[PDB]
Design a protein around this nucleic acid. Structure first.
Ligand SMILES: [Mg+2]
Ligand SMILES: [Mg+2]
Ligand SMILES: [Mg+2]
Ligand SMILES: [Mg+2]
Ligand SMILES: [Mg+2]
Ligand SMILES: [Mg+2]
Ligand SMILES: [Mg+2]
Ligand SMILES: [Mg+2]
Ligand SMILES: [Mg+2]
Ligand SMILES: [Mg+2]
Ligand SMILES: [Mg+2]
Ligand SMILES: [Mg+2]
Ligand SMILES: [Mg+2]
Ligand SMILES: [Mg+2]
Ligand SMILES: [Mg+2]
Ligand SMILES: [Mg+2]
Ligand SMILES: [Mg+2]
Ligand SMILES: [Mg+2]
Ligand SMILES: [Mg+2]
Ligand SMILES: [Mg+2]
Ligand SMILES: [Mg+2]
Ligand SMILES: [Mg+2]
Ligand SMILES: [Mg+2]
Ligand SMILES: [Mg+2]
Ligand SMILES: [Mg+2]
Ligand SMILES: [Mg+2]
Ligand SMILES: [Mg+2]
Ligand SMILES: [Mg+2]
Ligand SMILES: [Mg+2]
Ligand SMILES: [Mg+2]
Ligand SMILES: [Mg+2]
Ligand SMILES: [Mg+2]
Ligand SMILES: [Mg+2]
Ligand SMILES: [Mg+2]
Ligand SMILES: [Mg+2]
Ligand SMILES: [Mg+2]
Ligand SMILES: [Mg+2]
Ligand SMILES: [Mg+2]
Ligand SMILES: [Mg+2]
Ligand SMILES: [Mg+2]
Ligand SMILES: [Mg+2]
Ligand SMILES: [Mg+2]
Ligand SMILES: [Mg+2]
Ligand SMILES: [Mg+2]
Ligand SMILES: [Mg+2]
Ligand SMILES: [Mg+2]
Ligand SMILES: [Zn+2]
Lengths: 206, 97, 83, 60, 116, 97, 127, 155, 23
RNA sequence: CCGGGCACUCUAACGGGACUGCCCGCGAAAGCGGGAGGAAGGAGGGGACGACGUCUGGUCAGCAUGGCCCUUACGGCCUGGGCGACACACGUGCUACAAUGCCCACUACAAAGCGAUGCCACCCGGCAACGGGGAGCUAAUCGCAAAAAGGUGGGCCCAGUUCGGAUUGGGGUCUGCAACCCGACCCCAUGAAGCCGGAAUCGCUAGUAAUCGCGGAUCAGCCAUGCCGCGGUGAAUACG
């Protein structure tokens, strides 16, 4: 085990923090806990909508939870029934002026957090893992990516002897700093244990 | 007539120090240019592994950058258009006299 | 040791029984889990069972042992050498 | 015995000496930082994710 | 056997030579020559007989020394070993007294190694 | 001297003495056995006897495995002997030319 | 009229001010022989002008800040070695081949995890 | 090293005689990077050389260097099944290095209490052909001659 | 040396002050 | 320090800069040696960064998670004790065995950091640890802060010592509800081993090794001589 987090390895060069706000020493932990509590409920709820990233900004007394997603209406609801329902339950935790936006994901098959979750959904549905992994890679490359790599590790197919299966097409240069690489992880929970799913998408250099 | 700007990302800390020494400059009169104060560097060093392997670490830093600006010739025409200011989210302004 | 500016510490709950016995014309065997409590001259002559973590050790208190703590007289580690 | 100990650390104690910091994420008692309320593992986990404002990998 | 019962070394300075007495260190070397007004640099070989008996007298009447200091230190260790306190037991075994670890080291109190 | 570690098992002073008596077979070669260290442990398939020993002419590192623990100890010795006899005689091989 | 150079070493910065005169030298409110009193490495500072015969031609006003006394001394050496160049362009000859008009980047190497120092590794027993 | 030769570090001349060899001698005296002490001991001895013997410290110091340079030495080598002391010529770099090393090492064997006294006196004796330093150079040379019969193994 | 509390050099080592290292 | 100023130093953001680009030569070429310019030259020095895989490596005790197992107890609260035990054995370190040293007094020269029940100037009491006053600083402002080795002068005189600072007696400080087990520090006294270390073995190729001090995280305090950083002084050697 030896590979650096390819997002944490690009914070501030190719990627941008999911919680962007200044805060002095006596407050950092207090807001930081909020973002985590905020994200805990949200990733549970907006799961069914295709959640990808949750940007969080703060000024003073307020906080603007921007949410990117594949199916926007599943968050909004009918006219705004669910989107207003969220801010309601949201302001209980926030205890303050918690705005909430929703953002369209252009191609969900170019978002690594999404293809990872879909793979994890397939293997939970008792799908042929190796064939599934090749499908995801094929869906990402057909959608215009310049390279993709998907990894699935654990009791694949339910065998006692754990195994690591992966597939890749095109270019995934994990050492290149200027290379825009999206990364996402999902956690297929099976009757016999956990399988970890990693997805790499190469969107091009800069 | 003092405005202090603290923030983590220096791209927003500088672009916001520009949009004051530009705004109050036109609105008259004297603005003493943004002075980059030294950065205060919080440091975090942790073992990469969750168990033993004591001799492998990763270095993290949190950078509280600092800027100071003097709008030297106040004029309450400046101290009005600044009241509604489009400062990015990740910046903190302090204003004293 | 403990700052002279502060007081001579006794748990005050152990100390209550000492004075209630002195008045009544003491004594009776006092069970305590107070090793931290200083011996004080009101205790001289009594016998107090001090918990070492396992047993309460009956210790008789004399004139010479007053500045100490009750734990110093109920050792906690059974040891008789090796071999 | 651990979740009963994550709760006992939140309670205020009889004496202010028994105050000890835990992880507000995993309940870890050791290598827990004051600035984050996070242990050294969650610290590296979230920071790698990007969910710590300003925090970045330091190389010099 | 001059002062104070120890024939303190000549050839050396008085402040040094006084330290060759049980109970007089550097701190009491600075003290004894201040009260009796003697240059602490003067060698014992050059003490005037008045300076000697002046330095002898203050030294012996102010502090407990050699023999009597040894008796008290012993008597204190004896009674600690008699009331049966924790510091007493460690003296009844030769084991250390100030909380030090004994799994390793502790060879000053234990003595050179006892092979098994 | 010689140290014996029983990892995640418990053993008697008798078994520790057996190991010392078996390691004594290495004394045959009349070379210095410098801080010999035996590790005993149990896998799901049987016992594992590890050993690290330095001598004036190199190190001995061997691992024995077997259902029966005394046999795993003996397999360890057999591997240790062939390593020691190699360390002691290999230099003799190229005396000519 | 006045002649200035910037001299930097390990963590020392030295601002030298050359002024024609007899040779008196001032470093931080003191005379040279008073500030570097007892240091043998000191005389090495005045060397760039022994390469161009300015032994007593100039006087020295010199500030000093950061690092240690020898790095300051060497920073000074680079300082005046630059002020003479602006006093005469044709001083690269008989100063640049003498290594005087350059600054060595030899600086403390960073402490690194795993090691006791920059490179000194912890002791271990292989067996 | 394996890939290429190593480049000999040039030393800046000292600031009392302008000598690069005098510098290397100071460094050999230097313990714990206390160069100020190192220089002071040498020069302190350069006064003692002058005051016990009225002539040039620089000249005395340099002659004692030539008096400790070993012209040949033995360099081991295993030939078949025997370790042979092969006689070998010493490069001038190494001659210098051995000279300075033995000077200090032999000086610090001396009984004189203050170091600069030991550095002066040893350089005084070695300037004339005496002292444990020059002995060490003679001893090494006699070893090389004693083994001239093995001089054909030289590499 | 540094292990000697009763000297300045020992107090510099410990990181404390006293009669043998005043403030 | 006031006036005045951004020159300089600095601070911190954006750039320029080095490419075998030029010259000499060997080359089929790629490159190699040598030269000039230059602050830097052939990856400029250090960093971050670790391929498919290996060790059925490590971690169910950071977290997650399959399954097996406990349910007035294999769960939960508490007081106390233990994790600090000590015939021994190994690993890592600290301090040393002294004069290129030890002590005292005086006197310079850093960097990176940290600091609103926090950092504490300065005053007073105490030999001191520290205590009582009390100003400043949301901190390039005020503070921790003295850097130490070094420099000057004086003591020591080769001795188990003015080396070494273990061990123990007695007396105090402080944190803390509480220092018996089991805290750090101060003061008096005690003043051990150790006279440079067998077999064997570690590190380091340049601002490195060696040596000197400073800071931080954890933290009421602290068993830190540990760890992660920071600068000061500053070597030896590489035939192969
Ligand atoms: Mg380590
Ligand atoms: Mg239990
Ligand atoms: Mg749990
Ligand atoms: Mg605590
Ligand atoms: Mg904690
Ligand atoms: Mg004495
Ligand atoms: Mg202890
Ligand atoms: Mg103990
Ligand atoms: Mg053993
Ligand atoms: Mg066992
Ligand atoms: Mg193994
Ligand atoms: Mg056999
Ligand atoms: Mg800088
Ligand atoms: Mg001078
Ligand atoms: Mg260093
Ligand atoms: Mg190791
Ligand atoms: Mg040498
Ligand atoms: Mg010799
Ligand atoms: Mg001769
Ligand atoms: Mg001493
Ligand atoms: Mg300018
Ligand atoms: Mg080349
Ligand atoms: Mg690379
Ligand atoms: Mg678990
Ligand atoms: Mg489990
Ligand atoms: Mg089942
Ligand atoms: Mg306990
Ligand atoms: Mg433990
Ligand atoms: Mg044993
Ligand atoms: Mg041993
Ligand atoms: Mg240690
Ligand atoms: Mg050791
Ligand atoms: Mg050491
Ligand atoms: Mg701190
Ligand atoms: Mg002695
Ligand atoms: Mg002896
Ligand atoms: Mg002594
Ligand atoms: Mg005591
Ligand atoms: Mg305690
Ligand atoms: Mg001696
Ligand atoms: Mg030494
Ligand atoms: Mg050997
Ligand atoms: Mg190398
Ligand atoms: Mg030293
Ligand atoms: Mg420190
Ligand atoms: Mg602390
Ligand atoms: Zn955690």
């Amino acid at each position: 085990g030896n590979k650096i987090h390819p997002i944490g390895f690009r914070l501030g060069i190719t990627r941008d923090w999911e919680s962007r706000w200044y805060a002095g020493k006596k407050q950092y932990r207090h807001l930081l806990l909020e973002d985590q509590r905020i994200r805990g409920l949200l990733e549970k709820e907006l799961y069914s909508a295709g959640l990808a990233r949750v940007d969080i900004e703060r000024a003073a007394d307020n906080v603007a939870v921007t949410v990117h997603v594949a199916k926007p209406g599943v968050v909004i609801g009918r006219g705004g029934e669910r989107i207003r329902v969220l801010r309601e339950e949201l302001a209980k935790l926030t205890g303050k002026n918690v705005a909430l936006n929703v953002q369209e994901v252009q191609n969900p098959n170019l978002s690594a957090p999404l293809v990872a979750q879909r793979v994890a959904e397939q293997i939970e549905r008792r799908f042929a893992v190796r064939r599934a992994i090749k499908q995801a890679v094929q869906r990402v490359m057909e959608s215009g990516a310049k390279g993709a790599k998907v990894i699935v590790s654990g009791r694949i197919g339910g065998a006692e002897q754990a195994r690591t299966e992966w597939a890749a097409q095109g270019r995934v240069p994990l050492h290149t700093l200027r290379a825009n690489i999206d990364y996402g992880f999902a956690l297929a929970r099976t009757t016999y244990g956990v399988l970890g799913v990693k997805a790499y998408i190469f969107l091009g250099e800069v | 007539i003092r405005i202090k700007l603290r923030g983590f990302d220096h791209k927003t800390l500088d672009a916001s120090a520009q949009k004051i020494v530009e705004a109050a400059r036109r609105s008259g009169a004297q603005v003493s240019g943004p002075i980059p104060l030294p950065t205060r560097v919080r440091r975090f060093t942790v073992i990469r592994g969750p168990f033993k392997h004591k001799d492998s670490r990763e270095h993290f830093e949190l950078r509280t950058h600092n800027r100071l600006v003097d709008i030297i010739n106040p004029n309450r025409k400046t101290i009005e258009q600044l009241m509604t200011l489009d400062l990015p989210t990740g910046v903190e302004i302090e204003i004293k006299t | 040791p403990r700052s002279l500016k502060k007081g001579v510490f006794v748990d005050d709950h152990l100390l209550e029984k000492v004075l209630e016995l002195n008045a009544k014309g003491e004594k009776r065997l006092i069970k305590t889990w107070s090793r931290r409590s200083t011996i004080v001259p009101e205790m001289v002559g009594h016998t107090i069972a001090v918990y070492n973590g396992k047993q309460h050790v009956p210790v008789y208190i004399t004139e010479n042992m007053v500045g100490h703590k009750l734990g110093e007289f109920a050792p906690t580690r059974t040891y008789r050498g090796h071999g | 015995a651990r979740k009963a100990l994550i709760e006992k650390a939140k309670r205020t104690p009889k004496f202010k000496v028994r105050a000890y910091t835990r992880c507000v994420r995993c309940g870890r008692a050791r290598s827990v930082y004051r600035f984050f309320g996070l242990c050294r593992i969650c610290l590296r986990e979230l920071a790698h994710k990007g969910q710590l404002p300003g925090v970045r990998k330091a190389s010099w | 056997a001059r002062i104070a019962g120890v024939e303190i070394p000549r050839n050396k300075r008085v402040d040094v030579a006084l330290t060759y007495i049980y109970g007089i260190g550097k701190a009491r070397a600075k003290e004894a020559l201040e009260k009796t007004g003697i240059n602490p640099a003067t060698r014992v070989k050059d003490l005037t007989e008045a300076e000697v008996v002046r330095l002898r007298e203050y030294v012996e009447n102010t502090w407990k020394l050699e023999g009597e200091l040894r008796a008290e230190v012993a008597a204190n260790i004896k009674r600690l070993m008699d009331i049966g306190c924790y510091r007493g037991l460690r003296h009844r075994r030769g084991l250390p007294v100030r909380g030090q670890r004994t799994r390793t080291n502790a060879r000053t109190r234990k003595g050179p190694r006892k092979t098994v | 001297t010689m140290n014996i570690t029983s990892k995640q098992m418990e053993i008697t002073p008798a078994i520790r003495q057996h190991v010392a008596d078996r390691l004594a077979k290495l004394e045959k070669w009349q070379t210095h056995l410098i801080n010999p260290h035996i590790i005993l442990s149990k896998e799901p398939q049987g016992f594992v006897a590890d050993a690290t020993i330095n001598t004036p002419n190199g190190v001995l590192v061997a691992s024995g495995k077997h259902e029966d623990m005394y046999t795993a100890i003996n397999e360890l010795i057999n591997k240790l002997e062939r390593q020691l006899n190699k360390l002691q005689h290999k230099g003799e091989a190229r005396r000519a030319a | 009229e006045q002649y200035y150079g910037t001299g930097r070493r390990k963590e020392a910065v030295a601002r030298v001010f050359l002024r024609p005169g007899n040779g008196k030298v001032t470093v931080n409110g003191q005379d040279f022989n008073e500030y570097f009193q007892g240091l043998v490495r000191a005389v090495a500072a005045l060397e760039p002008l022994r390469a161009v015969d300015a032994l007593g031609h100039f006087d020295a006003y010199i500030t000093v800040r950061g690092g240690g006394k020898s790095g300051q001394i060497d920073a000074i050496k680079l300082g005046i070695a630059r002020a003479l160049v602006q006093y005469n362009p044709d001083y690269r000859a008989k100063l640049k081949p003498l290594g005087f008009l350059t600054r060595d980047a030899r600086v403390v190497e960073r402490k690194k995890y795993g090691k006791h120092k920059a490179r000194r590794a912890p002791q271990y027993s292989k067996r | 090293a394996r890939r290429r030769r190593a480049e000999v570090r040039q030393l800046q001349p000292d600031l009392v005689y302008g000598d690069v060899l005098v510098t290397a001698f100071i460094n050999k005296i230097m313990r714990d990077g206390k160069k100020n002490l190192a220089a002071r001991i040498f020069y302190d001895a350069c006064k003692i050389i002058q005051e016990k013997t009225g002539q040039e410290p620089l000249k005395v110091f340099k002659q004692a260097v030539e008096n400790v340079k070993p012209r040949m030495e033995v360099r081991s080598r295993r030939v078949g099944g025997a370790n042979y002391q092969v006689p070998m010529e010493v490069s001038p770099r190494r001659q210098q290095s051995l000279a300075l090393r033995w000077l200090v090492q032999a000086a610090n064997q001396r009984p004189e209490r203050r170091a600069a006294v030991r550095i002066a006196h040893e350089l005084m004796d070695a300037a004339e052909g005496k002292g444990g330093a020059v002995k060490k150079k003679e001893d090494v040379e006699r070893m090389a001659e004693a083994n001239r019969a093995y001089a054909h193994y030289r590499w | 040396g540094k292990g000697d509390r009763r000297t300045r050099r020992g107090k510099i080592w410990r990181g404390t002050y006293g009669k043998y290292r005043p403030r």
